[PDB]
Write a protein that binds this ligand. Sequence first.
Ligand SMILES: O=C[C@H](O)[C@@H](O)[C@H](O)[C@H](O)COP(=O)(O)O
Ligand SMILES: O=C[C@H](O)[C@@H](O)[C@H](O)[C@H](O)COP(=O)(O)O
Lengths: 564, 564
Amino acid sequence: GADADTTLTSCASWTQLQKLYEQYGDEPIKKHFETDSERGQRYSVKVSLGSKDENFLFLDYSKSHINDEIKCALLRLAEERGIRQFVQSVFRGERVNTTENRPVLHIALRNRSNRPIYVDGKDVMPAVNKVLDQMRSFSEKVRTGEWKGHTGKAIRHVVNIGIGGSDLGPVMATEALKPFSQRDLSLHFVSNVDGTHIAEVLKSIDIEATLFIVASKTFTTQETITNALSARRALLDYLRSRGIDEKGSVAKHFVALSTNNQKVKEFGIDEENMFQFWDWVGGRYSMWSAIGLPIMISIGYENFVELLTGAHVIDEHFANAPPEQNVPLLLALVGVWYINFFGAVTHAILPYDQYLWRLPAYLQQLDMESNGKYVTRSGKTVSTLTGPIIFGEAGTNGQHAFYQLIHQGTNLIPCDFIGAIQSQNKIGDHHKIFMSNFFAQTEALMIGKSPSEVRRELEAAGERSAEKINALLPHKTFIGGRPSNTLLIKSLTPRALGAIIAMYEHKVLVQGAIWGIDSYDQWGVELGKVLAKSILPQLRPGMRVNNHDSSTNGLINMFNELSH
Amino acid sequence: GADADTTLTSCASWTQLQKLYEQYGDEPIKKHFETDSERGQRYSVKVSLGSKDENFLFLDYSKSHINDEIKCALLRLAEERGIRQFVQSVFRGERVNTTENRPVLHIALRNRSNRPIYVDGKDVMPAVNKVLDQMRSFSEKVRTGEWKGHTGKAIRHVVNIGIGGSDLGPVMATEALKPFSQRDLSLHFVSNVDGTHIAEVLKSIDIEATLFIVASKTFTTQETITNALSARRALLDYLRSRGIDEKGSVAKHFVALSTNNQKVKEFGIDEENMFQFWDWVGGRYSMWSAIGLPIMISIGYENFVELLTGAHVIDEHFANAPPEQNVPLLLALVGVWYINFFGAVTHAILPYDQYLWRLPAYLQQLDMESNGKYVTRSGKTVSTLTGPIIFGEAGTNGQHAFYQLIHQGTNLIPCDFIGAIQSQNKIGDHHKIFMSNFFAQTEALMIGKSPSEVRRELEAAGERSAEKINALLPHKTFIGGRPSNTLLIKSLTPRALGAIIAMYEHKVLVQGAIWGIDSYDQWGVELGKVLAKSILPQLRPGMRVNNHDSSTNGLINMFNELSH
Ligand SMILES: O=C[C@H](O)[C@@H](O)[C@H](O)[C@H](O)COP(=O)(O)O
Ligand SMILES: O=C[C@H](O)[C@@H](O)[C@H](O)[C@H](O)COP(=O)(O)O
């Protein structure tokens, strides 16, 4: 391909970090706690959310292979790569998404201060606020029962039709903020083009009382349009079977969240029912825009404003807080330390909150689709590793699933443990039992259990058999020194969720800027789309192909032989 | 710790594989297709499931960096490490789980041939079949409406209470086999000790018509017992609020799936309502046993027998088929090639079937908890990498989520694409549109798009701007040579699911045997449990601690200050 990038590896700070890794990389995490009695406080930052309930976002990054020399060197890397100036460029509307020559302004969607942000010489704030007001008005009509279906019924089911950035945010947020929702409104999500997805939703709803929301930035995504057309056919099929006149039904049951005004009109949706968003709103950064309509319908306008405000508080913290006390910058640098120096290619998101069960899948798109790049903005091949593989499940289910590998496997896996001090559901002693695991797991990963400790524990329990002690000894040994970040909030309120997502959006921004890549494009999805479009007309019963490789030919031919 | 293991790295076959990697590792996958026109057929195996619908399990492992010399060398590794003899030892009941001195007989649970398998000189088959008959009788009473609640109502809600191996199988299988289910029976799963899990289920059920199933091998797991006690308190609280006599209510609403007869009696469950399983049934291999009761209640006895039969067909294939035509052995060897020689520490499970959306989470436990070990059976430290990190989501949602990283990231990620030729839900042209992506993605990962191909595509579309071509060129380039395995079935029937899970169970067996580890124990979960038990009595409002490291002390102290 192109020439190799030297801008990052030639930085004096990068050379120093490589030197510091060779020197201190083998030192166990516990050693840093033994030499610094105030490590927990010195390697942690509390950011107030500015609400009356005194909620906060506390990051503890102390359980890491980072001493003061490494922390200082990581901060110097941030200065050398011009992170401060890059952040200002993003926030002010500069076209940082260089491959598409477009601004990156998801921060404008939640700009509660209404500080003017310009695109093509025009302040975008009145347009942002106009859509938020349109969302308020419509969501209130749905929630109060004012918005009626074709047969006069109030809305009981809300079906979002969209994929990726037009699905994951709405799913994650409605699940995360379920205690703040209106329970009489059932939320359904159709995303997969697999006929099963729309089929199962159609079995679970009363189409007369259903509002379909077609969410798509482009309004041309094959999955979404195919599902939307089937949802429309279903509405018309129901009315026809009951003998009811179908004229004007689509306008009462369908709304659109898009940037493409022309494609929305071709479908048959009223322009009054189109909720606009812009090109500078990336799909994986769109839950704050019109895409957030199903979230607003579920939790209400005031709670949606709280979600936006939480993000805004972290946006202001990120842009203004000093480097050594900046939460998203520190989280990003700890990540760069593990990815580029330790060679850790995986990162676990472990939320100890059942409502946040869809957070790992959301962060998979946010991080992996943003930073899974191998070429820089200048078009040169990267000389370092970029985005890691994100995985995880809600705690404690993970403990009885894959923690065995995190504790005793052959891979170094940085983990983010997210938890809340207060539960929304106070059932007996469930929360303290739950949180005992939250604190214990990070402690366990850090300290481990040495061969000598295992021998003392077995001999203290009364085991006089030297054979059984020696045989079980290595299997019961925990090397420890496994890193983790602990993110603690007072409670998972809409403001708290907004804060958490914005923190991760900004972590991704910093990592992408350090590597010199474009965290805002997605050229990697194009080949699969083009080759699928070429294979589609070849999928007919009995048809034989020979234009692809022998594997693909054999697979398509077998499919055609047995499809029908 | 202990001495380093030399048994694997000293194998002549291992030394040869390292030599073959140095020689052929840089050769692109497409080169093997260009030199062998019959590669698709030669590097694929079709295993019949033995059913009247002519269903099968087809594995295509051709899209890999494997030529005939490497394939032969991988098969020689299997012979040298004694896989054939190890498999016979597992199937015949030998105590292969050396650290716990116990047999590994999940294959006995689905042994439809009723071939005698001995443990302590006694055939286990009559006991296996006795529980299957008990499950048949009870599941039929629940399904027909014969089993009544305390107030005389038929069962409408089935709530499984269990975690890990007592949760993931029941969740995955009931979701996977939803078209074969009895729709009037709503399945709920309480697993997390987070109060939210039981709370949300209690909001969704009619407790008078609810059967609670307490699933736990040991019947002492903190999460499960805490949830079970809250479910019991909920039943008694409801009856008390309505003024109804509670005597004999627990026996009508609670059943247990366990090995511990004593702990089940202490809870208050009738011995007639305890479904037994044994110590040789590992939790992550228990969906075929009594643990499968919620699956049988949902899909019925005949469909559960089909699930068992699918597993049995693959068990027989695995134990008897020649090495070069053995599906789980080949899948395991392709995995070893990528993990130990290419250094690929991640593996993606990408099922193109929405019903299989919980399959990746299931396989995470199966693979990661089994093979995430760093010590051998002999107690020596491994000299090779072991179990990889498993992740994934159902296709096509993954395409618009993280495929950007699989195609254009800095990591080599082996992928397993699983799909069905026939859908259970035939909605318009959804399935062909869906499957066009299935074939295209593996083709895309393999062939890529070279710098020259991108230039030809842009110049053919009419782009005369050399600047735009050169600028977009590297961003639109796909290096290709990304591996994948394609698993194709005729349709996802209960027999097909059984076949797929057994294949993965056996893949895990082979990989663990090659590495010389115990794939059947889980000592790695002990430290987190012990440290949580120590932290639990310290979680009281206002309490201050100083016995842990400064991070854990600071976290517990902050929690205690604001919990109440
Ligand atoms: O940044 C987001 C990604 O590019 C991707 O997840 C995108 O959101 C989907 O491809 C759906 O696109 P539409 O929203 O245009 O349907
Ligand atoms: O092999 C399985 C694992 O050890 C683990 O997932 C186990 O299933 C859970 O710890 C629940 O154990 P019980 O089934 O005993 O509650």
